[PDB]
């Protein structure tokens, strides 16, 4: 269905048992190694991309047309970018920083993230992975020891190409709440083209003809007879 | 004369060390193979402003670091000049030993020789340093 709650279940995925999240903010941290039982751990912050390559094909096998409304599927690269800060302080060497662990911690969220199709939204029909980039590239202005020198900044990117589909009916105006009022005024005083609504079968009408012996016509009208005026429920008669 | 020149403008030079500035840096080379050369003043040096730029063992990959470079202005010509192709060191620690646990590692990386009485040179830091 919609892309925020599934977007809500991507980071909860996430953060549910792998990636340890400190911060969510696009920026690398200057605060001290966070201590957690007496034990230091490197800062780290996950920066959330937005959205891109939002395209809706309509030309795959797995869209039923149920009849109701129709249906769509949605593309889409949802990225996210985690980076940890490494003082210099404690990592001297560029060789003794554990970007081995960092790399394992990174496959163990792509895994866990691909696993969870009936776990992010019912509605995943794909989830595919873009190869991912690890960089060890210095900290945006971070310094550590003396003489100034740039902190050890790893920074690691998860890029998942997800399809998945999507309706009509589930978008309301409770979901751009913050962003567009409900039922507003159009751009050049032109009239708003009105969505079909759901037709409800409230009566039935049928009205047969008696055609003539050698075969039905149904085009001219002196060859059929009416019979009679069918309402399929009776208390359709007087109301309609 | 540019023989006496240069010991008189370490004699003169060597009254900035008297005087308590924060500029001054301990240089110190290993111009002969295995021992020190340490230059005599404490010269000052400035910081020329990092820069980030893409890692010079591969220019091409992701590794990319900061370079970070000092500008030694006054330093004198009775150093030998093939001291200059051997690593420096600033604010080096000398123990019981003649080896150094501590200071921050860089390189020559480009001499400035216009003064006939001075060299003045900008070193490059090491991408890994002690402190």
């Known amino acids: 269905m919609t892309k925020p709650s599934l977007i809500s279940a991507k980071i909860l995925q996430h953060i549910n048992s792998i990636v340890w999240l400190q911060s969510k903010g696009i920026q690398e941290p200057l605060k001290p190694d966070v201590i957690v039982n007496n034990v230091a751990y490197p800062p780290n912050v996950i920066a959330e991309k937005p959205v891109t390559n939002i395209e809706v094909i309509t030309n795959s096998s797995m869209i039923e047309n149920t009849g109701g409304v129709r249906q769509f599927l949605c593309k889409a690269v949802f990225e996210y970018t985690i980076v940890w800060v490494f003082s210099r302080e404690v990592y001297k060497t560029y060789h003794q920083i554990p970007r081995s662990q960092i790399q394992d911690l990174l496959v163990f969220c792509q895994q866990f993230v691909i696993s969870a199709y009936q776990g992010i939204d019912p509605d995943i029909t794909n989830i595919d992975l873009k190869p991912s980039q690890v960089l060890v590239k210095p900290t945006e202005d971070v310094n550590s020891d003396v003489s100034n020198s740039s902190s050890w900044s790893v920074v690691a990117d998860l890029r998942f190409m997800i399809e998945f589909l999507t309706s009509l009916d589930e978008f309301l105006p409770i979901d751009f709440n913050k962003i567009q009022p409900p039922t507003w005024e159009l751009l050049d005083d032109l009239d708003p083209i009105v969505p079909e609504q759901p037709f409800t079968l409230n009566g039935l009408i049928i009205s047969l003809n008696k055609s003539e012996l050698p075969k039905v016509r149904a085009d001219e009208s002196d060859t059929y007879q009416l019979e009679e005026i069918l309402y399929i429920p009776p208390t359709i008669e007087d109301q309609i | ?131």
Not at chain 2, 2 to 21: A, M, T
Not at chain 2, 26 to 42: D, H, I, M, N, W
Not at chain 2, 82 to 110: E, K, Q, Y
Not at chain 2, 117 to 124: E, M, T, V
């Open chain 2, 1 to 131: 004369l540019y023989s006496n020149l240069i010991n008189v403008k370490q004699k003169v030079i060597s009254i900035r060390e008297k005087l308590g500035d924060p500029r001054l840096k301990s240089l110190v080379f290993e111009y002969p193979a295995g021992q020190l050369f340490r230059v005599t003043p404490k010269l000052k040096v400035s910081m020329v402003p990092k820069n980030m730029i893409g890692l010079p063992l591969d220019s091409k990959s992701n590794i990319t670091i900061s370079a970070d470079d000092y500008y030694i202005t006054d330093v004198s010509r009775n150093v030998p000049e093939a001291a200059f192709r051997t690593r420096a060191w600033l604010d080096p620690v000398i123990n019981d030993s003649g080896v150094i646990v501590s200071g921050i590692n860089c390189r020559c990386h480009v001499i400035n020789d216009k003064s006939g009485l001075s060299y003045d040179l900008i070193l490059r830091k090491e991408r890994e340093v002690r402190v």
